[PDB]
PDB file of C-alpha atoms in Angstrom:
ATOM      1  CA  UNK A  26     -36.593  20.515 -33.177  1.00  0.00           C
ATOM      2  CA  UNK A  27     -34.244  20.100 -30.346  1.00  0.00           C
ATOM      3  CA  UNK A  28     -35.261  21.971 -26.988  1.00  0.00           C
ATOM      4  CA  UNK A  29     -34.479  21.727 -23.321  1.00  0.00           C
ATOM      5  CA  UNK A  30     -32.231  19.271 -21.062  1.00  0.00           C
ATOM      6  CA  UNK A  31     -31.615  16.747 -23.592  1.00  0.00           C
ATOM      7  CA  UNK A  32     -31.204  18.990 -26.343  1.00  0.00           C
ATOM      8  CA  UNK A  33     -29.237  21.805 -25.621  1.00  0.00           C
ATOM      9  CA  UNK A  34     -31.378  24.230 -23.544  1.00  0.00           C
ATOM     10  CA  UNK A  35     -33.534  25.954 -25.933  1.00  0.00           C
ATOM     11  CA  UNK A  36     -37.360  26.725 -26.547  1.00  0.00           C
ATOM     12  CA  UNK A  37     -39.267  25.569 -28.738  1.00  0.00           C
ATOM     13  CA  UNK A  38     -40.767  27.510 -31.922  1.00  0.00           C
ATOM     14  CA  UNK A  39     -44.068  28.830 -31.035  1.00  0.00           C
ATOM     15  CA  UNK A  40     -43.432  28.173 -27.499  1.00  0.00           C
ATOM     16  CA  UNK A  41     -44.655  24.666 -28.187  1.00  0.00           C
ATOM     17  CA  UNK A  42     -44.304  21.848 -25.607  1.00  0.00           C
ATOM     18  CA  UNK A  43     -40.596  20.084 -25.154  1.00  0.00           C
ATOM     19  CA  UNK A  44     -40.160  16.866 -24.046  1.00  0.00           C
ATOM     20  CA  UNK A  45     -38.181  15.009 -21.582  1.00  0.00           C
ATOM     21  CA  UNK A  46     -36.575  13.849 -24.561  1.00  0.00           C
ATOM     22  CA  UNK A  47     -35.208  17.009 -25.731  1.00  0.00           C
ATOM     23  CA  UNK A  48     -37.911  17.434 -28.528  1.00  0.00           C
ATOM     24  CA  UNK A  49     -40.779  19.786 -29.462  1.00  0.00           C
ATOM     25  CA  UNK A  50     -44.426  18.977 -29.827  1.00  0.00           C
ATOM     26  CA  UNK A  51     -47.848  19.929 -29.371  1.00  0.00           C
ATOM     27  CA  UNK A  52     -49.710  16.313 -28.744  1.00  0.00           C
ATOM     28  CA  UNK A  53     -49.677  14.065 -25.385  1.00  0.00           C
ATOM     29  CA  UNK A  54     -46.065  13.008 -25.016  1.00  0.00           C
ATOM     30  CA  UNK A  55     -44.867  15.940 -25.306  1.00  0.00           C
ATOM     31  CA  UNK A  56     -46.858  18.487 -23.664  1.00  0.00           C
ATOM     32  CA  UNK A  57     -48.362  15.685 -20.862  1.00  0.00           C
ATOM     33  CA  UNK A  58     -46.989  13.494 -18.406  1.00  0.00           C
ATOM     34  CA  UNK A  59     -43.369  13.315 -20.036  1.00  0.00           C
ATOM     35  CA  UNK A  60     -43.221  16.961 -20.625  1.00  0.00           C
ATOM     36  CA  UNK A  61     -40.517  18.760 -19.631  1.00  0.00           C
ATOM     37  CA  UNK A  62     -41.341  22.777 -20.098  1.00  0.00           C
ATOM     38  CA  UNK A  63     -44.034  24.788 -21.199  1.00  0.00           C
ATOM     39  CA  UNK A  64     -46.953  21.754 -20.831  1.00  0.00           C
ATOM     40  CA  UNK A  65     -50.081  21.294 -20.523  1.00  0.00           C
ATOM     41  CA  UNK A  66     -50.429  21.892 -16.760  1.00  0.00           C
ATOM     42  CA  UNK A  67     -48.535  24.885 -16.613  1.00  0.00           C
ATOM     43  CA  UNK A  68     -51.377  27.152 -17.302  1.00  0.00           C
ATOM     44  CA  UNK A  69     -51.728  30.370 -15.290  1.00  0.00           C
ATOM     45  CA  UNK A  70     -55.507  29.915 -13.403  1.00  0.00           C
ATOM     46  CA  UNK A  71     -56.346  33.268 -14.386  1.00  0.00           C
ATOM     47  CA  UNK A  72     -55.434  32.239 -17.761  1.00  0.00           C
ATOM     48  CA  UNK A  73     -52.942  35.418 -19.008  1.00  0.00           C
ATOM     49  CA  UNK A  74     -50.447  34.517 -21.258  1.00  0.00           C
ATOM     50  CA  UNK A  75     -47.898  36.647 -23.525  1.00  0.00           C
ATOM     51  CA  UNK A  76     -45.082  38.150 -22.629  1.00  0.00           C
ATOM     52  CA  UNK A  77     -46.336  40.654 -19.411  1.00  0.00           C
ATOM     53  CA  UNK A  78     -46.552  36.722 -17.382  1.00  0.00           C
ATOM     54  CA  UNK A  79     -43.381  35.481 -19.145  1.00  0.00           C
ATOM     55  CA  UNK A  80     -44.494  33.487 -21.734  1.00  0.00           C
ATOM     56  CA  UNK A  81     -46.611  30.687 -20.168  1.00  0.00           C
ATOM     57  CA  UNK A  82     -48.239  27.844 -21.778  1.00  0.00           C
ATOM     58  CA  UNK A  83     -51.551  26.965 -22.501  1.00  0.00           C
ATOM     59  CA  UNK A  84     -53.661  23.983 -21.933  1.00  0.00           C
ATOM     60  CA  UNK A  85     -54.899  20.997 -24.480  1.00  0.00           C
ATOM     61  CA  UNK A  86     -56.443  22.484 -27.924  1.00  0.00           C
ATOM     62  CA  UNK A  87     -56.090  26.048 -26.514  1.00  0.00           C
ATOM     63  CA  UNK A  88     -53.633  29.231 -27.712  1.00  0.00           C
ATOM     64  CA  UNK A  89     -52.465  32.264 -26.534  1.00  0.00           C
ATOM     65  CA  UNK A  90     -54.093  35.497 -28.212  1.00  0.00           C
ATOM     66  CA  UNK A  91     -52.815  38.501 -29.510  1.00  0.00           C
ATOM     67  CA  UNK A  92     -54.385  40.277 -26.155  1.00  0.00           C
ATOM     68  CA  UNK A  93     -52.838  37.875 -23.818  1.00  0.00           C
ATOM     69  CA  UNK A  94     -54.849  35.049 -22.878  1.00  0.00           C
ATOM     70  CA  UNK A  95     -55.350  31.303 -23.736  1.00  0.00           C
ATOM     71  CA  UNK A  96     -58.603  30.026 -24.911  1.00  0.00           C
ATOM     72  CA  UNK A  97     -60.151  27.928 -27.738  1.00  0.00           C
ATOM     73  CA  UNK A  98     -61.157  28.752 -30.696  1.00  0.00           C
ATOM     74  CA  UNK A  99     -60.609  31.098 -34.027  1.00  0.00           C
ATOM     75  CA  UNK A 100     -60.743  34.190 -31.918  1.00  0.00           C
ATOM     76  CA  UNK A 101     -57.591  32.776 -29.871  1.00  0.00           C
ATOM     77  CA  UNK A 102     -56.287  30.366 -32.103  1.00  0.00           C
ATOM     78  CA  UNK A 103     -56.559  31.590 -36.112  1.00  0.00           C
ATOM     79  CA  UNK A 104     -53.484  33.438 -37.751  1.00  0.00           C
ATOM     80  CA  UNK A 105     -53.735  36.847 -36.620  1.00  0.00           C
ATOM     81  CA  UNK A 106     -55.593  36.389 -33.695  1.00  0.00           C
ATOM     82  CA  UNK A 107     -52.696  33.962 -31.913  1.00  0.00           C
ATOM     83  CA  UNK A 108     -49.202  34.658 -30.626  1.00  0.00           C
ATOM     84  CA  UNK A 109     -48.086  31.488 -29.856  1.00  0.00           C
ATOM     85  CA  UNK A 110     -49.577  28.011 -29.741  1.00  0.00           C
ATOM     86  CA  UNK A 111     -51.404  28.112 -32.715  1.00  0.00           C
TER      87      UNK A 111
END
């Protein structure tokens, strides 16, 4: 869906990657070097995530958990475990 500059200012579902483009999506154009908000690189170094930080992202192939940090994995990742970037 629409998100961001080019597409009217909002945030994505699941606080998924949005694109210079104005578009959401959670592979390489969208979340890498033509990302426009909440990419790839924007990962806290201490890694917290959730709403306490203000929503960050997290990096490549990794979610932000229930308790409020990114990380690989089911115990980040799987339904009930994950609050965004699933």
């Amino acid at each position: 869906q629409r998100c961001g500059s080019q597409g009217g200012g909002s945030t994505c579902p699941g606080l998924r990657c949005c694109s210079i483009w104005g578009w959401c999506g959670d592979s390489e154009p969208y979340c890498g070097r033509t990302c426009e908000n909440k990419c790839w690189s924007g990962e806290r170094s201490d890694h917290r995530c959730g709403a306490a930080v203000g929503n960050p992202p997290c990096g490549q192939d990794r979610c932000c958990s229930v308790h409020g940090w990114c990380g690989g994995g089911n115990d980040y990742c799987s339904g009930g475990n994950c609050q965004y970037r699933c």
